[PDB]
Amino acid sequence: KVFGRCELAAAMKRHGLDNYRGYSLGNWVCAAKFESNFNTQATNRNTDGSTDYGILQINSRWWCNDGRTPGSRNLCNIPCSALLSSDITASVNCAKKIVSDGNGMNAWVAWRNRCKGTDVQAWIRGCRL
Ligand SMILES: [Cl-]
Ligand code: NA
């Protein structure tokens, strides 16, 4: 599924991401835009052999099992394919684990390089929430 901007903002709010670990909703929408272009089916293979999955491009080296990343962990205890669903529950629950890991949203490279330090509230402006 390719989400609209305000549609994703509302879904992320219903799943409890607004101000989760201190990160306002616009941070999460910004991160999703530049990680996946709001596409739940996005996948990208990395040079180390791992793959990023879903709307927040969660990586198979640490967070999910895809059966082809040897020596990796599965810290969210999910198959990576669950992160491609049109329902974002699995991606949101796993993202909550990641952002609590100590480095906040700096775990997402696109957030650090394209969202951090910008007016992220612009990403939810005009939405009915
Ligand atoms: Cl933080
Ligand atoms: Na894994």
Side-chain angles (χ1 to χ4, degrees), residues 1-124 126-129:
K1 172 179 172 63
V2 177
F3 275 84
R5 192 184 46 101
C6 289
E7 187 191 9
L8 181 62
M12 288 188 155
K13 197 142 172 293
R14 256 217 65 81
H15 280 266
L17 282 184
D18 190 20
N19 299 315
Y20 191 87
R21 290 278 174 148
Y23 290 91
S24 61
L25 195 58
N27 284 284
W28 298 101
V29 175
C30 187
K33 166 72 184 172
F34 295 125
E35 286 293 354
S36 68
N37 214 17
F38 297 147
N39 183 1
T40 67
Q41 298 196 73
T43 61
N44 289 113
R45 193 105 191 240
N46 308 123
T47 169
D48 62 1
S50 69
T51 304
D52 301 329
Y53 294 88
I55 200 137
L56 287 167
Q57 292 290 277
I58 292 172
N59 184 263
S60 63
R61 179 81 56 191
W62 302 102
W63 308 103
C64 61
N65 176 47
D66 67 0
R68 63 166 206 201
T69 313
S72 75
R73 312 233 46 210
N74 180 13
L75 286 173
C76 290
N77 263 109
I78 53 178
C80 297
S81 56
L83 301 172
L84 306 177
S85 181
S86 70
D87 189 275
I88 64 169
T89 299
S91 283
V92 168
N93 289 358
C94 186
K96 289 180 178 169
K97 197 150 325 193
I98 299 174
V99 76
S100 308
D101 208 32
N103 291 113
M105 289 202 66
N106 295 290
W108 285 276
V109 169
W111 180 84
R112 186 161 47 61
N113 287 329
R114 306 180 73 175
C115 302
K116 181 184 202 184
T118 72
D119 176 24
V120 289
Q121 189 270 342
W123 288 99
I124 63 173
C127 304
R128 179 161 47 231
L129 293 174

